[PDB]
Amino acid sequence: DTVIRTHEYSNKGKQYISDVTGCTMVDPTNGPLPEDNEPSAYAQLDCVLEALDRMDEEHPGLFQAASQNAMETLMVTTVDKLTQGRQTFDWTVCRNQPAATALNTTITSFRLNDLNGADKGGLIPFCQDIIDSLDRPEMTFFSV
Amino acid sequence: MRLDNATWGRITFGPVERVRKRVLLNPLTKEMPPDEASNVIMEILFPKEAGIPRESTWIHRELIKEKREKLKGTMITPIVLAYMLERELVARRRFLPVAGATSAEFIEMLHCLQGENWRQIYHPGGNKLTESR
Amino acid sequence: SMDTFITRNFQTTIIQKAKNTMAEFSEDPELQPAMLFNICVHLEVCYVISDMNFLDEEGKAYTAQNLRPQYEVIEGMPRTIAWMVQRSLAQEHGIETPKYLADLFDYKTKRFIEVGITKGLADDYFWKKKEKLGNSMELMIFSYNQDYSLSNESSLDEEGKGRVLSRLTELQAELSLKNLWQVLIGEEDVEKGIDFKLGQTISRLRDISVPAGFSNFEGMRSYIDNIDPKG
Amino acid sequence: KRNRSILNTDQRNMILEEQCYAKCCNLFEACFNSASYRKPVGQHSMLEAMAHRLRMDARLDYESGRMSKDDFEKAMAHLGEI
Amino acid sequence: LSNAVAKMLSNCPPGGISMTVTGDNTKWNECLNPRIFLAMTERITRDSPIWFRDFCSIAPVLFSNKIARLGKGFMITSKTKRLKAQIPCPDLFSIP
RNA sequence: AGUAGUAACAAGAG
RNA sequence: UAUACCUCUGCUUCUGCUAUU
RNA sequence: GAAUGCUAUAAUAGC
Ligand SMILES: [Mg+2]
């Protein structure tokens, strides 16, 4: 239902095929404005930006002030931060598993693909390995 | 001991304008930031695994020794002792609807102190600060 | 360069155990080899003082079955291990823990030792490090121009004092032989930028994940960065 | 007691994987009591950490007089194997 | 909210009318687009260093190429025979 | 049967 | 096949995010 | 005549 509805409100948008996944991608943004009061996903970038510019004018420096703190936090943030999020989707077994385990299974698997950024302990170098893992031609993982 | 050595006045029926303010829920032995507080507890319970000696170490040398001497001959698990100290060093400070009573030893009894339409006079026990006075 | 030099002179123990000390401070071994060599020499000098120095069951120093040394090498061991060792020793013998991390500790003297290697004068560098410690650790300073400045109570024997000054000049000569001595002399400073570079895959996904009326992400970035959407 | 529905399915295996990590951690906590209270920090090996701590513990236990020569020999011999 | 209401209440022009729209938004998730969230991070991190502008950009980028797993599937039954079977999501178009 | 209600249980497994 | 009138199981038959902390 | 910012396995709220 969600999958149908999401696309039902974007159907008048730009439809294309992803040359990465091979998936059927739909893009409503900068699309034709609505003719009726049926839910519309056709948001106009210019209007989103103008709205944020006013917000930035009304709240001067807030964006960079936040960005600074958010960035300085990330530098201090360790990997174990990811082990406090209930049931998380584990890609090794394709079933939900505890956040703490789902991570462990990813760290163990990453090591096999020569990705030890985790070991450094900071979140950034572990995140670097995640966007690098997409470039690997094949991904190996343990399965008992 | 505070509830026990307390004295109860009269209940009064009438309008109370409760105001939502960030108050301390529990009286502390000595207030420190969680970071400073954590380093103190380490010196009390786990000396070897303390890390870099900080200024704080010296500042609470009386409290460290006092607590170390008081918890010395016990058989309770260090992890419990650790949280029991954290409870009376780290501040539990949260928003609450209050009316003319902010002192922690009053806030702990806040449920019995008033509602929107009534008020209860209550004198706690032990001691009260000259600063709060 | 220094990369090929350190491989010849120092063993893989001293190489790695320095690179870990450099890693803990979050600084690249390759992008600052001057800082690597400093810690390498600092570590190698410390191990030579403790190498054959052993204690018997009575409690007297002797030269080498037996697994209990006279000194404790703190330099090299990871911060949290080093500090555990430094705190363990202090609390056991019953002395106050120095606020700065020590290099060595003599089990017979029952005092902490601070080691230092200087380019200029060994006598000057003694009074420089006397401001922070004062009398927390018994300093033991050396330099490459055959110059030693130990504390009034120096446990280092005459036969031991040579081995240090031999290896100090032997390496200093080996740097001047390969013409890499000049690399360590010149001032080296660089702020370690927190670089997070995107791969090829994720970069493609970002380019297809753009609003309509955009070629690639670069386009969307410059638009948001530059143009004004008022009205 | 833990829901034992798991004992019927092939997921059984994970109990051993758990009861392994459990062993490694529980022992680490016996070496470092502060681990229970505050998160331990280090990019070095758990074995490296545990080894050095026990090595000191043994030495200071001997030199203080908590441990005997016969025991210390065993201690340094066993730690030698690592 | 008590403070906010009080100020916006008293700020009402004399003679004018203050009106409160008790509001809810429909299909909040189905309509809100990742690429718009991408724009937001770019516009918000404008002064931040290039690595952190990119770091933020990833999360919306993943969500603009995300894939929804369809869960367990559908169960088919014969009342006469008293049989039931789970059709897994991969085998959804296996039956007419 | 029934519970229940946009899909299940009315035991499952070796 | 059989052991099986036996044995094991009762959230693990996919339970998320953000806040009150 | 003010502060001190956090960070559960419950429950509530919205998605
Ligand atoms: Mg809604």
DSSP string, D52-70: HHHHHHHHHHHHHTSS-HH
- Name the residue among E27, E44, E69 with its Cβ closest to that of A9: E27
Range of the domain at C78: 1-192
Helix (H/G/I), strand (E/B), else coil: E43: helix
E81 is in an annotated binding site: no
With CB atoms and an 8 Å threshold, state whether E51 touches C224.
no
Rounded to 5 degrees, φ, ψ at C15 are -60, -60
Residue C138 lies in a domain: yes
Show Cβ contacts of residue A26 under 8 Å, excluding neighbours closer than 6 positions. A7, A10, A11, A13, A14, A15
What experiment produced this structure?
X-ray
Chains E and D contact (Cβ–Cβ under 8 Å for 3 or more pairs): no
How many angstroms separate the most distant Cα atoms in chain C? Answer: 91
| SS3 per-residue string spanning A67-128 | HHHHHHHHHHCECHHHCCCCEEEECCCCEEEEHHHHHHHHHHHHHHCCCCHHHHCEHHHHHH
Residue A142: other Cβ atoms inside 10 A: 11
Per the CB < 8 A criterion, the answer to whether C112 and C100 are in contact is: no
According to DSSP, residue A37 is labeled S
CA of E29 from ligand 1 middle (Å) equals 9
Task: Say if strands C115-118 and C140-143 run parallel, antiparallel, or are unpaired.
Answer: parallel
Cα–Cα distance list, D51 to A29, A122, B92, C74, D58 (Å)? 59, 25, 39, 15, 10
| CA-wise closest residue to C89 among C104, C79, C77, C68 | C104
According to DSSP, residue B31 is labeled -
- How far is residue C208's CA from residue C138's CA, in Å, rounded to a whole number? 65
- How far is residue E44's CA from residue C16's CA, in Å, rounded to a whole number? 42
Cα–Cα distance list, B130 to B103, B107, B127 (Å)? 12, 18, 10
One-letter identity of residue E66: K
| Residues making up chain C, counted from first to last | 231
**DSSP per-residue letters across D16-79:** HHHHHHHHHHHHHHHH-THHHHS----SS-HHHHHHHHHHHHHHHHHHHTSS-HHHHHHHHHHH
CA of B88 from ligand 1 middle (Å) equals 43
Per the CB < 8 A criterion, the answer to whether E28 and A37 are in contact is: no
Protein CA A39 to sugar C1' H14 (Å)? 19
Show Cβ contacts of residue C176 under 8 Å, excluding neighbours closer than 6 positions. none
Task: Say if strands C104-106 and C61-63 run parallel, antiparallel, or are unpaired.
Answer: unpaired
- How far is residue B90's CA from residue E18's CA, in Å, rounded to a whole number? 45
Neighbouring subunits of C (3+ Cβ pairs under 8 A)? A, B, D, E
- Rounded to 10°, the helix A62-76/E34-44 angle is 100
| CA-wise closest residue to C99 among C90, C108, C107 | C90
Kindly state the tokens that stand for C134.
């004062």
- How far is residue C88's CA from residue D58's CA, in Å, rounded to a whole number? 11
Rounded to 5 degrees, φ, ψ at C62 are -155, 160
User: CA torsion, points C128, C134, C135, C139, in degrees to nearest 10?
Assistant: -10
Kindly state the tokens that stand for E20.
């409160």
Chains C and B contact (Cβ–Cβ under 8 Å for 3 or more pairs): yes
Residue C95: other Cβ atoms inside 10 A: 13
Kindly state the tokens that stand for E65.
């190429």
Residue C93 lies in a domain: yes
First-residue to last-residue Cα distance in chain B:
21
C80: burial class by Cβ within 10 Å (0-12, 13-18, 19+)?
A: buried
Q: CB less than 7 Å from strand H: which protein residues?
A: A 84; B 21-22, 31, 33-34, 90-91, 93; E 24, 28-29
Residue C224 lies in a domain: no
- Name the residue among C196, C204, C229 with its Cβ closest to that of A49: C229
Residue B97: other Cβ atoms inside 10 A: 15
Protein CA D19 to sugar C1' G8 (Å)? 21
- How far is residue C107's CA from residue E64's CA, in Å, rounded to a whole number? 64
Cα–Cα distance list, E6 to A72, E9, E18 (Å)? 37, 5, 12
Show Cβ contacts of residue D37 under 8 Å, excluding neighbours closer than 6 positions. B41, B42, B45, B46, B78, B79, B82
CA of E23 from ligand 1 middle (Å) equals 9
How far away is chain E from the Cα of C32, in angstroms, using its nearest Cα? 23
Protein CA E85 to sugar C1' F11 (Å)? 17
| Residues making up chain E, counted from first to last | 96
- How far is residue C184's CA from residue C39's CA, in Å, rounded to a whole number? 13
| Beta-bridge partners for A90 | A95
- Rounded to 10°, the helix B34-45/B78-87 angle is 140
- Say which residue the tokens 């080894």 belong to: D51
Cα–Cα distance list, C140 to C46, C106, C122, C154, E7 (Å)? 10, 12, 10, 8, 70
- How far is residue C169's CA from residue C162's CA, in Å, rounded to a whole number? 11
Q: Which chain C residues touch E66 with a CB distance below 8 Å?
A: none
Kindly state the tokens that stand for E32.
């809100």
| Beta-bridge partners for E77 | E84
According to DSSP, residue A32 is labeled P
First-residue to last-residue Cα distance in chain D:
37
- Segment holding B114, helix H or strand E: strand B114-115
- How far is residue C78's CA from residue C57's CA, in Å, rounded to a whole number? 30
With CB atoms and an 8 Å threshold, state whether C202 touches E58.
yes
Kindly state the tokens that stand for A61.
């420096």
Q: State the total domains in chain D.
A: 1
CA of C10 from ligand 1 middle (Å) equals 67
One-letter identity of residue E10: S
| Beta-bridge partners for A17 | A24
- Segment holding B55, helix H or strand E: helix B55-59
Residue C5 lies in a domain: yes
- Say which residue the tokens 């190996």 belong to: A140
- Name the residue among D41, D57, D60 with its Cβ closest to that of C80: D41
Kindly state the tokens that stand for C118.
């200087």
**DSSP per-residue letters across B59-107:** HTHHHHHHHHHHSTT--S-HHHHHHHHHHTTS--EEEEEESS--SHHHH
For strand F, which residues in window 5-64 of chain E come within 7 Å by CB? Answer: none
Buried b (16+ CB within 10 A) or exposed e, E12-39: eeeeeeeeeeeeeeebeebbebbbbbbb
Residue contacts between A and C (CB atoms, under 8 Å): 51
Kindly state the tokens that stand for B108.
């702990």
| CA-wise closest residue to C210 among E57, A23, E22, B26 | E57
Resolution to 1 decimal place, in Å: 3.1
| Beta-bridge partners for C71 | C106
One-letter identity of residue C51: D
| CA-wise closest residue to E8 among B18, E16, E24 | E16
Q: State the total domains in chain C.
A: 1
- Name the residue among A80, A121, A144 with its Cβ closest to that of D43: A121
Residue C197 lies in a domain: no
Kindly state the tokens that stand for A103.
């991570």
Residue C209 lies in a domain: no
Sign of the torsion angle spanned by Cα atoms B18, B20, B23, B25: positive
- How far is residue B91's CA from residue B63's CA, in Å, rounded to a whole number? 17
Show Cβ contacts of residue C53 under 8 Å, excluding neighbours closer than 6 positions. C61, C63, C69, C70, C71, C160
Kindly state the tokens that stand for E37.
């969230």
Buried b (16+ CB within 10 A) or exposed e, C107-131: beeebbbbbbbbeeebeebbeeeee
- How far is residue C209's CA from residue A24's CA, in Å, rounded to a whole number? 13
- How far is residue E71's CA from residue E85's CA, in Å, rounded to a whole number? 15
One-letter identity of residue E73: G
Protein CA D24 to sugar C1' G10 (Å)? 32
C93 is in an annotated binding site: no
Helix (H/G/I), strand (E/B), else coil: C104: strand
Rounded to 5 degrees, φ, ψ at E87 are -85, 110
Nearest nucleotide to B33 by CA–C1' distance?
H4
Kindly state the tokens that stand for B111.
């449920």
**What radius of gyration do chain D's Cα atoms show?**
18
Kindly state the tokens that stand for C86.
């430094």
According to DSSP, residue C69 is labeled B
**Planar angle of CA A17, A22, A27, nearest 5 degrees:** 35
- How far is residue E15's CA from residue D75's CA, in Å, rounded to a whole number? 90
- How far is residue C94's CA from residue C74's CA, in Å, rounded to a whole number? 19
- How far is residue A17's CA from residue C208's CA, in Å, rounded to a whole number? 10
Chains A and D contact (Cβ–Cβ under 8 Å for 3 or more pairs): yes
| Beta-bridge partners for A89 | A96
Kindly state the tokens that stand for B35.
């970071």
User: CA torsion, points B114, B119, B124, B127, in degrees to nearest 10?
Assistant: 90
Kindly state the tokens that stand for D54.
């026990």
User: CA torsion, points A78, A83, A88, A90, in degrees to nearest 10?
Assistant: 70
C151: burial class by Cβ within 10 Å (0-12, 13-18, 19+)?
A: middle
Locate the DSSP E strands across E18-92.
73-78, 83-88
C194 touches chain A (CB under 8 A): yes
**What radius of gyration do chain B's Cα atoms show?**
19
Residue C229 lies in a domain: no
| CA-wise closest residue to C19 among C100, C76, C79 | C76
Residue C89 lies in a domain: yes
- How far is residue A49's CA from residue C230's CA, in Å, rounded to a whole number? 9
- Rounded to 10°, the helix E50-63/C201-208 angle is 70
